Amino acid sequence: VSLSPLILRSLAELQDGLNTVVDKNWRQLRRPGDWSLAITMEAAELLDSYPWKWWKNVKAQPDLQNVKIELTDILHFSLSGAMQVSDENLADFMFFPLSDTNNALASFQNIIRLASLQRFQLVTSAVIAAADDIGFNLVAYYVAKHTLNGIRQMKGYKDGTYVKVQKGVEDNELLHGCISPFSLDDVTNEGNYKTKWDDIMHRVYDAFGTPKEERLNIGHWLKS
Amino acid sequence: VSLSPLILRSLAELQDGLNTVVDKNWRQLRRPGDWSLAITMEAAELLDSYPWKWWKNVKAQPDLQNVKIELTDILHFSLSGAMQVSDENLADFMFFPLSDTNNALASFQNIIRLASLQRFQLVTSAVIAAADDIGFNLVAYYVAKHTLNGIRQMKGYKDGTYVKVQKGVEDNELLHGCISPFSLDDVTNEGNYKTKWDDIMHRVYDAFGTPKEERLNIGHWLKS
Ligand SMILES: O=c1ccn([C@H]2C[C@H](O)[C@@H](COP(=O)(O)O)O2)c(=O)[nH]1
Ligand SMILES: O=c1ccn([C@H]2C[C@H](O)[C@@H](COP(=O)(O)O)O2)c(=O)[nH]1
Ligand SMILES: [Mg+2]
Ligand SMILES: [Mg+2]
Ligand SMILES: [Mg+2]
Ligand SMILES: [Mg+2]
Ligand code: NA
Numbered sequence A, B: 001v002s003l004s005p006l007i008l009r010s011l012a013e014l015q016d017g018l019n020t021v022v023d024k025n026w027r028q029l030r031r032p033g034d035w036s037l038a039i040t041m042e043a044a045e046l047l048d049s050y051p052w053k054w055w056k057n058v059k060a061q062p063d064l065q066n067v068k069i070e071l072t073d074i075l076h077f078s079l080s081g082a083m084q085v086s087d088e089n090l091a092d093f094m095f096f097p098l099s100d101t102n103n104a105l106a107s108f109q110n111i112i113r114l115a116s117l118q119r120f121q122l123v124t125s126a127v128i129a130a131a132d133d134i135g136f137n138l139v140a141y142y143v144a145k146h147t148l149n150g151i152r153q154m155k156g157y158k159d160g161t162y163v164k165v166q167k168g169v170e171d172n173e174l175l176h177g178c179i180s181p182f183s184l185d186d187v188t189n190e191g192n193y194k195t196k197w198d199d200i201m202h203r204v205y206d207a208f209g210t211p212k213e214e215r216l217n218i219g220h221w222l223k224s
């Protein structure tokens, strides 16, 4: 399973633009090992979405909606790593169906191994395969979380003044509703996808009350 | 750096007894990969004690007291793994001083690699080396956290009714004060160590108001 190369390139452009919001000269400041560590830590969030602990709340239920968020986060970081290292310098590492918690725990631990080896392109392929298997719209999730990531930067995430959970709702949870109106074809159609990505962005901006003047539309992010 | 084999054996006995509190037949129920995953997840807690994120609260300070707690947690799990697999089936993986955050991030990521390879004895050696380098009393930390772990089980940790942070204080934080009166010699002295471990246990029981009747003294845990 792979995305169209034109879709992958647009996602990469979005990723570069977001990384530039975080730091103008990120391509000089960041190193491959940074992206390895970030993927590791998202992979721990992903594992922690399951009731893996045999000593703590053993009848807990998995947070399968959060799984989608953490896979999307891994994609942001694997796209970023791939901009710095091609893998030169799947069925062995990923186990389907991921609906089986044993398969998920094994697979997602193997993502950490791939990350440590700086096989970022393979991590991207793993995430695409995982979304295909689970049946969620990875591209739409990406555009939505990309927008939230930018919003967080606007609202002081980098200086420690942001609050992610408010009135019982984590910011990430509001993304599901922003994405549900969009089909896979909507966000991958060769001629029209950019308009649909723009629509996702504005839904996320609405969800967080971003004043119109502070919003960045799809064209901000693309080099095509 | 290593502990006396008699001290290591007593720690292993304590570990077996705690694992038995969690499940009577843990030696049949648990598998090596469980301990790999647990060490991985504690290693993520440990990494997250540092200001590693370049996009979120970049001027945050490391939680160096929590570092001691997470290393102690790793030891519990590496002792446990070693009861199931000897490594048959350091300066390369650990970088000193760990006071240097770059050294810490690299070292603690390498603990995840060692855990995935099920080199539990090597993980134990890493933790002992880390405490020696940082200069904290690993054995005293172990006995204190071992006691809290048992307390958590008494107070519904396994069924999801426990609350770890109360009135602004996480349970782990109360351990530091329980341990500070004890020297390295106190808790490793060949003839007298068991009394000092018992004393640590009772200090932790006091910290949590454990009724005298529910307390388990040092003799509960030892087979010597
Ligand atoms: O240079 C960076 C740093 C962070 N992120 C994004 C990707 C993930 O979706 C998100 C995770 O944020 P945390 O919740 O882990 O803070 O951060 C980037 O895209 N680029
Ligand atoms: O079979 C088990 C399960 C857990 N722990 C202990 C070791 C760590 O100190 C502690 C970590 O607990 P959490 O905070 O991760 O729940 O659990 C054990 O000793 N044995
Ligand atoms: Mg994260
Ligand atoms: Mg995440
Ligand atoms: Mg833990
Ligand atoms: Mg811990
Ligand atoms: Na998360």
Ligand code: NA
Pocket (backbone or CB within 6 Å): B045, B070
């Ligand atoms: Na912790």
